[PDB]
Write a structure and sequence with these properties.
Chain lengths: 86, 82, 88, 85, 84, 88, 86, 84, 88, 85, 86, 82, 84, 88, 86, 84
């Protein structure tokens, strides 16, 4: 039993050592992962902000077109009426 | 003598604590890769949408020329009409 | 002649007026609905973070309880080994 | 006058167009907002569920400890008895 | 007369020597056997306590599976409502 | 020679008394071992049955776990379907 | 694109399932080898203990034989000692 | 249509992975238990092989001593026969 | 284990104590018996020497008595010879 | 403790051994002494017997003398008578 | 008778002379014998005294041996108990 | 004349006295040879007994060496045992 | 007448001479005989006195032999006691 | 011649008287010797018988002496046996 | 050693018995020779006394014969003396 | 066993010596008595042989005297015959 006790001490110490190494490698991995996550969050917000701003010029472009189509439609109505003096 | 049984008790508790640390690091990492991907996901969605809007405004700038041209054509017509 | 063309013009003016009026009402209700929702969202974000922080804090309580139990169990097994060795 | 009627149609057309863009943007924003709100309610419910789970775990563990502390003592007693021969 | 006595002391010395080996073998074997009995009773007690712990886990899971099953159906009712 | 006879017979009676005493002790131990073997055999059988019952119930634990997991996957999946339908 | 996210989880789940299966496979192989060694160690243990129990008889006989001779020496020395007088 | 198939895939894969992780977890717990038994088995075998070699040594020692005591007995008997 | 070896040791201590106590009592009775006997011996030696000295002294009394008788007998025979010669 | 029990057995063994030697020497001395005492009683009895024997011899001799002295005188008488013729 | 008387005187004188010679030779013999007797008595007492003294060292030698045998017996008991930790 | 009968009387008594002296010398000598022999006897007994004891102590001095050796052997054994 | 007388004196002288020799021979022989008678009576008296002295010696020895015989038996009884 | 005759007859008568007296004396002595011889013969016979009886009784004396001696030897021998048995 | 003392007295008693027997033997031989001389001396004594008693007769006759002659001389001288006168 | 034979030997030898010493003592007392008789015997024989030689001498003397007296008688008778 006194030789078996020391056998347990040696095994447990070696197992603690292995778990400690693994936690250390995981602690480094998580540190790197958080930095990357913060980097993507910032890049994600920038893309969403640029898209939200660009929505304004999409609408103006659409309103500009609508404005011209109505202009054409109205001018065609006037020509049709002027020609109708026959 | 009886230090051997104490060392095994104390070692068994420390290993137990480190294995809790390890397993909690593994769980947080799993959650951190999930969120990272949700983030890249939402970003690529915005990049793709914006790129599509860009191509839309560009096309519309061309198409506007043609409308501005048809317009003018029609003012001239009215003038030759009046 | 121009009477009818006038008639169709006046019909278009009225129709555009009713349709514009309807779309504006709809725009007003949406803007008000968004204000209520933003307020609601801010409230839900705050509750969600507090719960997650409280969950993160309690995880220590879980680990400590679990290690405490593990330590006692090792203590039981060890005492039993000491009984076994004393009997021999 | 037709000139004034026709410009009224023109001006109403544009103005309607612009309120419709405004309408559409608000709807799109309402939908994203509702979708965000849903994801936050889910995330909170899940945190609250896991927490109640952990709380029962801590409670079981605490009562288990109570029984184990009593077994420790009984075994100390036994060791002391054995020690006195 | 004296020789017969020296015989009997000799013979009893050996006979006692032999029974003492018999006794000490019985007592050793008894010690091993009480040791084994105890290990078996411990091992059974651990098996029983762990089983009972698992049984509580399964009883809980049965109640928790009812909550999950009920959430499932509410959600299907919601997809149905959305689909009309 | 008288005294030597006295010491000889003294050794005989003592050795007789000690052999007799050790023989009684051997007999009591022989009885104890028989009952103890019987007890050990019974306890081995009960231990094996408890471990067999534990080993079989492990399946019940796993199926309970998988059933829950399947249900949890189902909940989140139905929720994803709802979120997609709402954005249509 | 919800489809983009779905196929993304399908691929991840496939790689994750494959990795767990590899781990489960190695454990099953490891378990088979370990059971075999256990059966061999149990067989060797039972044979050693049986041989030990049998040999205990030889130890007892040997010790009792020596004890007999020692008593015989002591008895003879008493006999010579008495002859030296009467 | 294609979407419904993808989400069914994800669910089937989630449950199949779940089942394989339960299998893995149970294999790890078994292997640990088997490693423990194996240690206890070699332990007892080493202890038995150690006692046996110890007993072999005591037999041999008793044998060498018996050899030597047989001759002291022989000498002491001749002494006596000369005396008587 | 050590319990039994302890038990046999304590049995040996008690047995040696009773046996030592018995031998000492026997030693005391013998030492006292020797004192009485030495005293007795001294007395018998003294009486034996006095008797032998008294025997040695009385031997003269025997010799003198015997020679006295012998002298008278010679005197009788001589007187008878004188009577015989006177008658002749 | 076994160490103290075992030294107690050792010390009792030696001490018993020494009292037994003392016992045996006293017995041997008692026997020689009794054997001496016997030889002295015999020697005295024999001296006393021979003495009583001698005493009867002296007594017989003394009474014999008495009778012989009377025979001497009777013979003197006879010689005197013969002398006077 | 007067010639017979002188014959008795001569014979008795010669007989007295012979008895006197014999007593004289016996007186010398007894003197020598007493001296020898005293010499043997002294030598006898010296032997008995030397034997009585030597009895002490016989016993000590015997007690010394007993002491060593018990020592061996006790040491063998201790070894047997230390080896019994199996 | 009558001196002859007196001389025979007186001589007969003297011879008688010397023969008593002689016979008493013979008796004492017989007793003195008996005691002398008892003395030599007791002496030779002591010389023989002592000689036997001597040979005993000498043998025991040898045999003691062997016991002192077995002893030591066993102390070493215990030490290698502890 | 005178011659006859001288004859008778002569004859009587010789006859007396002869009877006187006869007498003196008888008286001498009587003296020897009284001498012998006395020696015989002395020798008988010595024999009788010595015999009587021997008879007392034997009577004493008879009583003394009883004491010795009694000591013998007591001593045999003592050997018997010692032998058990 | 007358006187010579007177002296002659005087010698005859005296010689006759003396012869007569001596003859009487011889006769008385002859009688005495006969009785004396008879007495002597009787006394010789009694003396021889006394000496014969003494000579025969000497045997009785010796046997008495040897009997005692044998008994004395027996006593000391039994005593030696007792002394040897006591030292065993 | 009581046996040593016993054989010691046996040997002494044998030598002492032998010496007494030699003495008894010489006395028996001496007695036989002495008896013979005694018988011879008795025979010579009786013959001398018998011859003496017989010769006493010759002595008496011789003396009486001489006495007769002396008386005869005295008587004759008386006869001559008387013849010388008447 | 051997001891019992030795002590019986000593006793038999003691009694046989005793008997021979009685024989010796009786022979010495006899020889002394025989020596005395022999002296008394030669004594009387010498006395008788001495008297006889004395008587022989007196006879011879008486014979020589008778011879001489016969012749004085012869002379005195012749004287008388001459006278008458």
């Amino acid at each position: 039993e006194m030789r078996e006790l020391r056998r347990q001490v040696d095994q447990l110490t070696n197992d603690k050592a292995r778990v400690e190494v693994e936690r250390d490698n995981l602690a480094e991995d998580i540190m790197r992962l958080r930095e990357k996550l913060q980097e993507e969050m910032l890049q994600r917000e920038e893309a969403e902000n640029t898209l939200q701003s660009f929505r304004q010029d999409v609408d103006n472009a659409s309103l500009a077109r609508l404005d011209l189509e109505r202009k054409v439609e109205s001018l065609q109505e006037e020509i049709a009426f002027l020609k109708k003096l026959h």
